[PDB]
Amino acid sequence: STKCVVRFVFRGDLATLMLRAVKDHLKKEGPHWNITSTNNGAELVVRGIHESDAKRIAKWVEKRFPGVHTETQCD
């Protein structure tokens, strides 16, 4: 089945706080998800998720943290 990577890049004075708040939310709904942090705690990478969930979590973060950069790549 298709699997996807989603990358969130937070910018600004609260970027690291935003990343951790979002990571907490995603781990609550996907405790088994492969979620790691890069770019000095400003980039959040979620690996190996279904396309339906990648789009849903993309829309969730963009609605609430509009200044985030969101990239989704599926396989």
Residue numbers in the entry: 0 to 74
Could you give the paper's own sentences about this structure?
The RGD (Arg-Gly-Asp)-binding integrins αvβ6 and αvβ8 are clinically validated cancer and fibrosis targets of considerable therapeutic importance. The highly homologous integrins αvβ6 and αvβ8 bind to latent transforming growth factor-β1 and β3 (L-TGF-β1 and L-TGF-β3) leading to release of active TGF-β1 and -β31–3. Here, we describe a method for computationally designing hyperstable RGD-containing miniproteins that are highly selective for a single RGD integrin heterodimer and conformational state, and use this strategy to design inhibitors of αvβ6 and αvβ8 with high selectivity. We found small α/β ferredoxin folds were able to scaffold the RGDLXX(L/I) binding loop without clashing with the integrin while making additional contacts with both α and β subunit (α- and β-loop respectively).
For the ease of aerosol formulation, we sought to increase the stability of the engineered inhibitors. Four variants with additional disulfide bonds stapling the N and C terminus had considerably increased thermostability, and bound to αvβ6 with subnanomolar affinity; mutation of the RGD to KGE abrogated binding to αvβ6 confirming that the RGD loop is necessary for binding. For αvβ6 integrin, B6_BP_dslf had the lowest IC50 (1.84 nM), followed by B6B8_BP_dslf (3.79 nM), PLN-74809 (4.36 nM); B8_BP_dslf had no detectable binding consistent with its very high selectivity. Taken together, these data confirm that B6_BP_dslf and B8_BP_dslf have exquisite selectivity and affinity for their respective integrin targets, with considerably greater RGD integrin selectivity than the small molecules PLN-74809 and GSK3008348. We also characterized the pharmacokinetics of B6_BP_dslf in the lungs and serum of healthy male C57BL/6 mice following a single dose via different routes of administration. B6_BP_dslf was rapidly cleared from the blood following IV and IP administration with a half-life of ~10 min, and following inhaled administration, B6_BP_dslf had a half-life in the lungs of ~1 h. The properties of B6_BP_dslf are unchanged following aerosolization: the protein is monomeric, thermostable, has the same CD spectrum, and binds to αvβ6 with similar affinity. In addition to the highly potent anti-fibrotic effects demonstrated here in the bleomycin-induced lung fibrosis model, the reduced systemic exposure due to the short serum half-life (~10 min), high selectivity and affinity for αvβ6, stabilization of the open αvβ6 conformation, ease of production using E. coli, hyper-thermostability, and aerosol formulatability give B6_BP_dslf an improved target product profile as a therapeutic candidate for IPF.
